[PDB]
Amino acid sequence: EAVKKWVNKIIEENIIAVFAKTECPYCIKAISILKGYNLNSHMHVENIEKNPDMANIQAYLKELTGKSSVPRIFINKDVVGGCDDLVKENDEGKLKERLQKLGLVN
Numbered sequence: 001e002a003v004k005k006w007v008n009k010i011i012e013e014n015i016i017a018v019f020a021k022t023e024c025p026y027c028i029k030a031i032s033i034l035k036g037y038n039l040n041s042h043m044h045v046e047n048i049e050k051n052p053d054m055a056n057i058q059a060y061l062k063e064l065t066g067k068s069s070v071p072r073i074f075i076n077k078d079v080v081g082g083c084d085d086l087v088k089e090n091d092e093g094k095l096k097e098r099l100q101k102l103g104l105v106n
């Protein structure tokens with residue numbers, strides 16, 4: 001219960017929520033893509049490796065998204081997925097549409 005409530009708070013209190021780990025190139029790439037949209041004011045990055053309950057967190061993220069791997073990316077509580085998913089959305093215009101509907105980009 002405690003771990004799920006903690007993850008839920010991160011997802012629900014930040015429009016852009018990224019679960020990451022230490023020295024994680026696709027985490028770094030995904031976060032940098034998001035910051036390139038000037039999203040930092042509404043972003044939260046949680047390093048779940050530096051956490052005693054990493055496995056519980058990962059299992060819950062898999063229950064929510066289908067994968068336990070990081071990065072795990074949510075936008076307004078909707079599942080984006082990993083960095084490859086973000087790259088697909090970015091390249092195909094979906095990421096910008098998402099952010100426009102939230103008022104985060106013009």
Ligand SMILES: [Cs+]
Nearest residue numbers: 035036037038
């Ligand atoms: Cs920037």
Ligand SMILES: [Cs+]
Nearest residue numbers: 033036037038
């Ligand atoms: Cs951009």
Ligand SMILES: [Cs+]
Nearest residue numbers: 040041043044
């Ligand atoms: Cs931030």
Ligand SMILES: [Cs+]
Nearest residue numbers: 051052053054
């Ligand atoms: Cs532990």
Ligand SMILES: [Cs+]
Nearest residue numbers: 075076077078
């Ligand atoms: Cs939503």
Ligand SMILES: [Cs+]
Nearest residue numbers: 090091092093
């Ligand atoms: Cs783009």
Ligand SMILES: [Cs+]
Nearest residue numbers: 102103104105
């Ligand atoms: Cs706005």
